[PDB]
Amino acid sequence: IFETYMSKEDVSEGLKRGTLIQGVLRINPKKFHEAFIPSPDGDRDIFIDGVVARNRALNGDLVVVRSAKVVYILEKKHSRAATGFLKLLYALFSPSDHRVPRIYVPLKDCPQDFVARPKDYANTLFICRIVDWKEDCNFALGQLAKSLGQAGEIEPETEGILTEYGVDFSDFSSEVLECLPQGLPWTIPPEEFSKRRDLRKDCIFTIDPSTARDLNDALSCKPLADGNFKVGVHIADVSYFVPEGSDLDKVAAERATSVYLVQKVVPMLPRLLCEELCSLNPMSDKLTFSVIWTLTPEGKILDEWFGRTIIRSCTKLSYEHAQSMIESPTEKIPAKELPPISPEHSSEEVHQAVLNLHGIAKQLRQQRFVDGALRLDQLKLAFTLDHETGLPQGCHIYEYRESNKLVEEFMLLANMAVAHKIHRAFPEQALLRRHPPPQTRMLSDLVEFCDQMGLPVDFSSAGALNKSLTQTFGDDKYSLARKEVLTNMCSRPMQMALYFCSGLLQDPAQFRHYALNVPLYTHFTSPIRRFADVLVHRLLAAALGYRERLDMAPDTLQKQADHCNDRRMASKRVQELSTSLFFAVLVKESGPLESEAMVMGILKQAFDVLVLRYGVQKRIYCNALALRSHHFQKVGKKPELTLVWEPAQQVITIFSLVEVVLQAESTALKYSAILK
């Protein structure tokens, strides 16, 4: 039995006075009896003990409240749905996630076969929605939605996590497709040859991954007569095809971002706009919102010009061909291994252009990292799948080659220029991004860990952290894995970047983006994938005088920014769970996997390893080992584990190389790591 809520008047009086604290509660996934809310001042996170003192609040909900109890909930931000197995002791519903409680389902809603034949529905996934939670029941009451399929397959589990996080994957209604342009061979109206600059004769190319349906940007470089370069970044304008107030705009605001999975993509726009009308496919006249600079070979801006233009791309490179033409500076690459090119242009022009853009991008990278920019890069693996069955065949870690940096530098230049322009035009309504500095309290724990063990790292500033992480060790077989484990330890106290409106924050200290070490930043180069990009596009168009001033209030922009923030968070969590699902299926269908590992932590009966080939973090317990004995020691707050397997002995401490094997178990989506 819980305790009843407080009325609105008391909550308003308490909040205005300052006796009550609002926050977004975070629940530990591994232990569900404890919860945490952030302090307003910036002190240690306020602890919430018990399950009773959470008082029917779920993870992600914002509440109004040293150990404390939750007494009021303003906004319910959780989706209130879960994927679980159906059992008996009404009927009981058990979710896979342990933060959602256990749910009662009425026996009228259950299928007829289930009451007669319970066993045959013992490995089937069901989706249930919580509708009400009583004051006298420890279990919520729910409604059964549908039958997903067999547990452990690919499509039932994918649709289960998409519905559990709230991503709307349903098809577009016809009132959305009625706002699209009509006519199958759409062409540019002849009235746009006067409001736009004609760039159809220049050399324009795109560099995006080979498996990319939609293209958001194009690049160009032209050498001048005094040793300078004219460098242009051209973005497909989705604000021409998305009018304000139409049902297309309401749907695109409803889903802030598009979600990328292992096997498919859940889009933001209709497929016509995402693939044919707006994406910069080669050999077609397209409308773009370009930025054009004149740069020195050292990467210094001498001119800047914004404006609407018309382009015609000549080729579509990938991240694989671009490295070939970078790594062949003085040798003609044969045309057999190149994508098709428009007949007006030659492969020499494109080949020369990639070299010049790489030459500028190297010096821009060096100058940005002298200025203090920080880069914490973890491991991102990519799969190779079966075309017909749809099961994964094999994984390999993605490789961040030079061509992935050549594009990234120019996207940063375009974003910084657009941020300056739209902030200097409208100071009271502008959408910008911000990265706070990391929290000092839980940076201090990393300070006290790394001050020992003879490791000279410092967390005073971002540039200091980057130079410390790079100079101390490199170019050794153990040192690269050492770099990976230190990066994984360092990436934990960092905060997440936020969208915000410039008319509500008062002081100019908050605006600066910490990790890039710049005072102003925004998102302008990906309209098809995000909706904040479309808002920035409209604001920039209003600033240059192409249209009238936005008729949107500065508080509605804050509400829209909060919605885009929560949607981005849900998108990142969904991609993480999809990658984990496909890796578990690969381990089950490819036998035991052998690799090496480094110990990242030690405990009395367990220790954490990091598998070097795959980058996952499993846990290894001494109960599963075939050992005679084990002893735990600590000296100078340094853990040590001694294993007795005349038998031999092994000593394992932090940053020790072991050999591990991954083996699937009888459960559908589980595996285990065992020492070899």
Residue numbers in the entry: 49 to 113, 231 to 254, 265 to 820, 828 to 858
Please give the exact wording used by the authors of the publication that reports this structure.
Dis3-like 2 (Dis3L2) is a 3′–5′ exoribonuclease that plays a critical role in human development. Dis3L2 independently degrades structured substrates, including coding and noncoding 3′ uridylated RNAs. Unlike a number of structurally similar homologs, Dis3L2 can degrade structured RNAs independent of external helicase activity. We determined the structures of an RNase R/II family nuclease bound to a series of structured RNA substrates and analyzed the kinetic profiles of wild-type Homo sapiens Dis3L2 (HsDis3L2) and engineered mutants to reveal how this nuclease achieves highly efficient degradation of structured RNA.
To understand the presubstrate binding state, we used cryogenic electron microscopy (cryo-EM) to determine the structure of RNA-free HsDis3L2 to 3.4 Å resolution (construct Dis3L2D391N residues 1–858: carboxy (C)-terminal truncation of residues 859–885; and an engineered catalytic mutation of Asp for Asn at residue 391 in Dis3L2). RNA-free HsDis3L2 has a vase-like conformation in which three oligonucleotide/oligosaccharide-binding (OB) domains—two cold shock domains (CSDs) and an S1 domain—encircle a funnel-like tunnel that reaches into the Ribonuclease B (RNB) domain and leads to the active site. The OB domains provide a large positively charged surface, which probably acts as a landing pad for the negatively charged RNA. The overall structure of RNA-free Dis3L2 is very similar to the structure of the mouse Dis3L2–ssRNA complex (MmDis3L2–U13) (root mean square deviation (RMSD) = 1.2 Å, calculated over all Cα pairs). Thus, the apoenzyme is preorganized to bind single-stranded RNA (ssRNA). The vase conformation is the only one observed in the RNA-free form and with long single-stranded 3′ overhangs. RNA-free Dis3L2 is preorganized in a vase conformation to bind RNA substrates (yellow), with a seven-nucleotide-deep tunnel leading to the nuclease active site.
